[PDB]
Write a protein that binds this ligand. Sequence first.
Ligand code: DUP
Ligand code: CL
Ligand code: MG
Ligand code: MG
Ligand code: NA
Length: 327
Amino acid sequence: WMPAYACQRPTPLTHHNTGLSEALEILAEAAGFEGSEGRLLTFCRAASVLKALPSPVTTLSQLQGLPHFGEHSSRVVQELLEHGVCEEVERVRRSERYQTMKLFTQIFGVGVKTADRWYREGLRTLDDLREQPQKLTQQQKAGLQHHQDLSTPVLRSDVDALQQVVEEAVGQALPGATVTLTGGFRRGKLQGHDVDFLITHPKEGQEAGLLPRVMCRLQDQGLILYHQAFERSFCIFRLPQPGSWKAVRVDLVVAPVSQFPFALLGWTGSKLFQRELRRFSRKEKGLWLNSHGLFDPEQKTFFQAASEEDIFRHLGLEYLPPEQRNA
DNA sequence: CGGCATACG
DNA sequence: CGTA
DNA sequence: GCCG
Ligand SMILES: O=c1ccn([C@H]2C[C@H](O)[C@@H](COP(=O)(O)NP(=O)(O)OP(=O)(O)O)O2)c(=O)[nH]1
Ligand SMILES: [Cl-]
Ligand SMILES: [Mg+2]
Ligand SMILES: [Mg+2]
Ligand code: NA
C-alpha cells in the first residue's frame, strides 16, 4: 500500500511521525556531510515514507513491507520506540564534526566541500572565518555578514509585501510579466529559509533578457543587499521591519511561458519530491524531466504542457497539489 | 552489482 | 566551486 | 542504505 517513489504518494506538510522522520533526517544530513549521497538518499526516503503514513508508527512490525526500511533505518526507529532516543542519532547531534559542518554549510556561499576543507584546516566557528576574510569569496562574505538575519525564518506574513515590491519592478521591466510564489510557501509552509518567485510573460519570447532589467530596478530602489545574461538570481533583499529592516534571501527565476509548468513544478519542490519525480520519469517511463521540459529520448521530442496537471498525466501519475508534495 | 536529479551563476 |  |  506504499509505493517506492515519493512522487507516487501524497505527503502532507504536517503528519503523524514527526519525531521519527526528524531522527532519520539527521542521519541523512550527516551522510551528506561525509559525501555519501546514496546513504543520504536512503535516509531521506525512509523519513519521507513515514511522513506519508496515515497514523503514528507505534510498533516495529508496522515497518514491515515499507519501502526504504532495511536493517539500519528499522533499528533507528526501534530504539526511538523503545527508549525515546536513538544512540547513533544523539552521537551525531553532539559531534563536533556534525555541528561544525552544519554551521558552515548554513552560510550562503558555502557548500559541503568548502565546509569540509575549512573543518580539516581546524576552523570551527563563524568568528574563525571572520578573522581570515582573505579566504572568503564575495558571496561568502555577504553570507557571513548577513548570517544572523538569514538564520531567522521568513514568515508567510512577510511574503505578500515582498511579492508586491517584486511585481512593481517586474511591471516596469516588462509590462504584463507575472510573478508567481513558488518554493516551500507554495506547498503551504508558514515559514521558509527564503522566498522563491517564478517570473514569466504570456507572450512567448517577451521574457528574454528580463531578469537583468528586474535586478537593475530592484537595485535602483535600494532593496538589494547582495546579488551577483541570466535567468536565475539568488539575492539578499532588504525587508522592512518595525523601525528597521532585516536581510532576507530571495530567489528569482524567469521562464518562457512554454516552460512555465515545468519550472513551476520544479521550483515548487520539495527538493526530495523533485529528485524522486525525475528519477521516476527516467527509470520508470524512460523520459527525461527537468525545470525546462520533459524529453522523449527515443522520439527526440519534448512534451508540451499547459499545466502541472499535464505533466503528472504525461508521467502516468495521479495529480498531487503542492500541499501534498512535502516529501 | 549499479544507481542514486538535473540544471544555472 | 557556488546556487535552485 | 536500500531497490530492483
Ligand atoms: O537542490 C535543489 C534545491 C531546490 N530545488 C527546487 C525544489 C525546492 O523546493 C525549490 C526551492 O529551493 P529552496 O532551497 O528555496 N527550498 P524550499 O523553498 O522548498 O524550502 P526553504 O526555502 O524554506 O528551505 O527548488 C531543487 O530542485 N533542487
Ligand atoms: Cl552513500
Ligand atoms: Mg525556498
Ligand atoms: Mg530558494
Ligand atoms: Na551554504
